[PDB]
Amino acid sequence: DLASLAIYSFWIFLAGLIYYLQTENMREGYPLENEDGTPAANQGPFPLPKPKTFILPHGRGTLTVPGPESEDRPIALARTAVSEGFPHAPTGDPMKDGVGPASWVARRDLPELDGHGHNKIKPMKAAAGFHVSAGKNPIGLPVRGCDLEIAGKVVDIWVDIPEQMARFLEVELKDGSTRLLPMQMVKVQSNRVHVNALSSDLFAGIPTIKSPTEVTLLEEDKICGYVAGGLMYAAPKRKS
Amino acid sequence: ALLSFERKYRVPGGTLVGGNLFDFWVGPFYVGFFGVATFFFAALGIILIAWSAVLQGTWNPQLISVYPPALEYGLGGAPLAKGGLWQIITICATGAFVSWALREVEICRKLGIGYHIPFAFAFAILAYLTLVLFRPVMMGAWGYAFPYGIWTHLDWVSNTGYTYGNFHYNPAHMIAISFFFTNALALALHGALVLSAANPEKGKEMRTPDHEDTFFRDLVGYSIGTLGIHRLGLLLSLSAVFFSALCMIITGTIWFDQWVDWWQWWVKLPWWANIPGGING
């Protein structure tokens, strides 16, 4: 019967499709590892797929995956138990060391570029002719931390030019230097910007950027990870 | 047992209950208090389903069916073999789903991410609870809930629907279906868009989000953008489930007649009710 043939065939097709899809999703993070970095004995029933290569725009190279995996950074953690499957305690300050929820990845230390090869993200002051078009303008507002102290003041918005969206607030600190705060981690209010993730004293420790008019993917990861990490690591100095 | 980038994230903390007591993994799986609760609820639930299969006298997965108490029991307990097992399996299931969501919250806290995932899942739980708890309570009997069986749950959907004529005429059902269809359409388009940019024509460089905006604007004159589309898909699919639960909470309670006749209010409006011609005059 043609319908039973069709249904039987579909189940075979679907097994192959799931196989294809699962292997496609193993182009990163594999092979699996033991807690010390070495290849784990058990890799599971799915083999790695044949490598594929992406051509990156603006002469930035290619990416081939799967490929050799490495963290390319020290991980200030250590075991807390004698067997597999337990947590790894920070060896220093987990905010400073970039571990746990404060983690960052070693992405390329260049800025993301738009389709024309210009920097994707710019301070609004350098983006012609971008301006706040709706909602409360954060520029000028005092910035408050989860300890209810003023950490600084907003001096600009970092905007995504091609996508016309606000990505960071540039906040100036007591010493005249600035930090980027992720837009998704601030609450803009009528009389302040509030930052639940960080107490006021942790603002100086936000990873700085090396050029004051651009930000690299690497710098972005360090800033975002640092701010998110405060949720767990600033919890003691917070605060109903 | 660990992805190549995983170890830096496996720190202590984030748990809701128990401190470090259950703060550990089993292979890839995080555990936590709610991993223990999930296991307890799920295991008891499956044991009880298997017990129900023994009392029904079959092991065929296409035949096993656990029915709620008959209508005559109302909202009280029933003998195990006559709807009581269903009652306990339902407590177990709810236990398991809520445990699962709460374990998800623990995982969010460890990972320093937003709570969006367990929030979205709660909608699914609410829809389940609408069918097995809220609606049956409002209607006065457990027996209006669906049975736990692969084919029998489908008999229930059919019998329940036809109790009101063609269920297509439920207006909240109509909105719900529209969100479902629109969600699937958006899923197809999101998936296709990202892939069409990451995997361009042979030999060409990866396209940018700018190309993605350009393509959709070229096509339909608008682009929701990259944050927009993930907001969209979340909204569409949660709205589908909200209106799914709505469409049923109102059926057998505030409306209990044939849904087709609900639409008469529009036709019977004074200013055109009596004009001849058309389909209704």
Add this chain to the structure above:
Amino acid sequence: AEYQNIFSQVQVRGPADLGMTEDVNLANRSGVGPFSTLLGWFGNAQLGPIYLGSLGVLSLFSGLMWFFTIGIWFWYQAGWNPAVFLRDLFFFSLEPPAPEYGLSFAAPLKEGGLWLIASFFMFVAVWSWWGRTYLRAQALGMGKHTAWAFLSAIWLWMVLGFIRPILMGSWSEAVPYGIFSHLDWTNNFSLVHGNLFYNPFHGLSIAFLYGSALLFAMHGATILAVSRFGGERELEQIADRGTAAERAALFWRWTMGFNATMEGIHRWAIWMAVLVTLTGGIGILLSGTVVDNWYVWGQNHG
């Protein structure tokens, strides 16, 4: 309250974005529409530009002709009365020829001929719009994933209105043009084929429809949860994995014991979706051509 990224707190605007050139014939692009502050709370404020082109003009014109052919019939059914039109809007129906005309085009205007005309305009509107999804990707150097996904929807459409009718031997099998009447057609199709709940392809179609909502709920929620690390910049995370993509993956690994990549999730996405109308179209195509009664079929297991 932690801010949730459902609606933007602050909108910013710059010069109207005219988009990427690549191989696009720029003569065929409109200018920018207005900017909707309303839309801009949720997505992009900018409207337009759009791309015209001959195919686009054909498609759109043809699509309106389809729409107007149905509206004309609706007005006629209302006896030209505006008040009856609005009152009975969902009750009107442009219906296919009777079985007796078979597949012929010899049916009278009022008894099927107008249905065929409307159908004709829909046919060219849809297919020319498909060619459009291909060509807009081509001119931009992009993959053809959109046109390929669109073909899955077209498949169900074609099966319902064209392929299944031709195979059954008459246009009377096709779907009527009407709000309520398309629903009645749907209910009646199931009834006449012994209950679609016994069609394993209808059941797969549902698994994927539900599946699409599960997955987009999952994916959408995930991206939003990691948007504090730039998660929605999916293409640069594919090209250069960040902590967004790693926390995303690990959420799911810790929860359900496996996970995706930033590129691979979008492959799960496209397939979960296209399989709705793919299995769907097969379930319908087989109905009446090969299987008269799905309950009966299911008793023989096949």
